[PDB]
């Protein structure tokens, strides 16, 4: 509809950098996420111990920040300049939330520092409309309506207008 309420918004961007058993790289990956997003990233530990990627239970193998608001738009567009505004058509989920990933933090536009090595990151963007709080609120929590839920096709259209992305 042309209802103001049915306007899609970028609810959240998640920047996750998963390294492994090297230990030092994880701390440095957090610092470049802190300087990119401007908020402090948190660390996700391992759920299982696997010898092949040295994964050990509770080894803090990941670092991620949830960026919301105007900051999220700036980071997504800078990442999409690395992708040259081209995304796969199937990179969109059934929920209407899409994602992309880049290698090399320098490609985003961050300046290089010798102490911290280049680390790539995954960019997952969640698309939402005003009125979706009915799923997340503590009191009177009910599922969003199927019409009000973002459809994968309607999400492609929104991003092909906002960032002129071609699929």
């Amino acid at each position: 509809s042309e209802n103001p309420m049915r306007r899609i918004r970028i609810e959240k961007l998640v920047l996750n950098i998963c390294i492994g058993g090297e230990g030092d790289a994880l701390t440095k990956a957090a610092k470049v996420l802190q300087q990119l997003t401007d908020q402090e990233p948190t660390f996700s530990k391992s759920r299982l111990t696997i010898r092949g990627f040295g994964i050990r239970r509770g080894q803090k193998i990941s670092t991620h920040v949830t960026v919301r608001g105007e900051k999220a738009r700036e980071i997504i567009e800078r990442g999409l300049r690395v992708k040259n505004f081209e995304l796969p058509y199937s990179c969109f989920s059934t929920t209407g939330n899409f994602g992309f990933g880049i290698t090399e933090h320098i490609d985003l536009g961050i300046k290089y520092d010798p102490s911290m090595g280049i680390y790539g990151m995954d960019f997952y963007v969640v698309l939402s409309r005003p009125g979706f709080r009915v799923n997340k609120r503590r009191a009177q929590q009910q599922h969003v309506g199927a019409s009000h839920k973002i459809t994968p096709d309607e999400a492609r259209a929104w991003v092909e207008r906002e960032f002129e992305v071609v699929y």
Partner: protein
């Protein structure tokens, strides 16, 4: 890719629906059980709950007893009644919540005292004449022939924080004279080594909205118009908030009786339910529509 639906017929057959108000998300039955439970040796003596529920538009404060098949509302005062007492805007603000609580407490105590005369509950428990951050416990000193009315705060699904507005209505009930047990930890002023009456006094007097109003107007007049359009439209001066609040507290104490306003009822008739023959007729039409492609 080819997978069974999570919600199978078996899922629905074995599904146990939760309680109607739990499904709605309106009530926590674990909290309610403790708030409603009374000793069996006390039998049917009524147990009162001071329920403070905050809708976006107003703060609803009520005193309710738990009957076996219903809840009885002994008294209920709403923030929407505050314009009659001289508070036109910020009806969901912390200061308004305190005055809504004062209104329910005074309204109930007055209703108990309407005909008693000899030892009226309101006469025996007047309350704090001035709205202050000082901790007041009516139960601390009691007539001993009459005791302060006791009710227990019910916040529902609200998170208990220092400065939360649910506590402000409880302080107004306490200020009116209702004995509501409290610790004053979740009040603006508790700092471990003591209570700063000044900090609570300020929230009760609406200082936080009025300092913001003064700062916002200076920093950006246009945002002040957008943020506080109703205040500018109600001709409420920012500094005047404390005077308005003190006058309101006095106006509540002098006459807490409900105006008992009544309005029109507008009910849309909506669609009439289809008759069984009408449903059967739709089935014939649906079969005919599918038959020709």
């Amino acid at each position: 890719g080819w997978v069974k639906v999570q919600k199978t017929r078996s899922y629905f057959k074995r599904f146990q629906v939760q309680f109607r108000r739990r499904r709605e998300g309106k009530t926590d039955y674990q909290a309610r059980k403790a708030l409603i439970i009374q000793d069996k040796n006390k039998y049917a003596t009524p147990r009162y709950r001071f329920v403070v529920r905050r809708t976006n538009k107003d703060i609803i404060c009520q005193v309710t007893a738990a009957e076996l098949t219903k809840d009885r509302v002994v008294c209920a005062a709403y923030s929407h009644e505050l314009p009659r007492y001289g508070i036109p805007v910020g009806l969901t603000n912390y200061a308004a919540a305190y005055a809504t609580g004062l209104l329910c407490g005074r309204r109930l105590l007055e209703k108990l005292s309407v005909g008693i005369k000899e030892n009226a509950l309101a006469q025996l428990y007047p309350g704090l004449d001035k709205a202050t951050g000082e901790e007041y416990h009516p139960d601390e000193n009691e007539n001993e022939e009459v005791h302060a009315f006791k009710a227990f705060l019910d916040i529902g699904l609200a998170r208990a924080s220092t400065g939360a507005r649910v506590f402000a209505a409880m302080k107004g009930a306490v200020d009116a004279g209702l004995n509501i047990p409290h610790s004053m930890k979740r009040f603006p002023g508790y700092s471990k080594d003591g209570f700063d009456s000044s900090a609570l006094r300020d929230r009760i007097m609406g200082k936080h909205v009025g300092d913001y109003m003064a700062e916002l107007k200076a920093e950006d007049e246009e945002t002040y118009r957008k943020r506080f359009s109703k205040y500018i439209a109600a001709k409420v001066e920012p500094l005047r908030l404390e005077a308005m609040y003190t006058k309101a507290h006095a106006a509540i104490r002098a006459n807490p009786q409900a105006v008992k306003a009544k309005f029109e009822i507008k009910k849309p008739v909506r669609q009439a339910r289809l008759t069984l023959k009408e449903r059967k007729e739709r089935i014939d039409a649906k079969k005919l529509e599918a038959l020709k492609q």
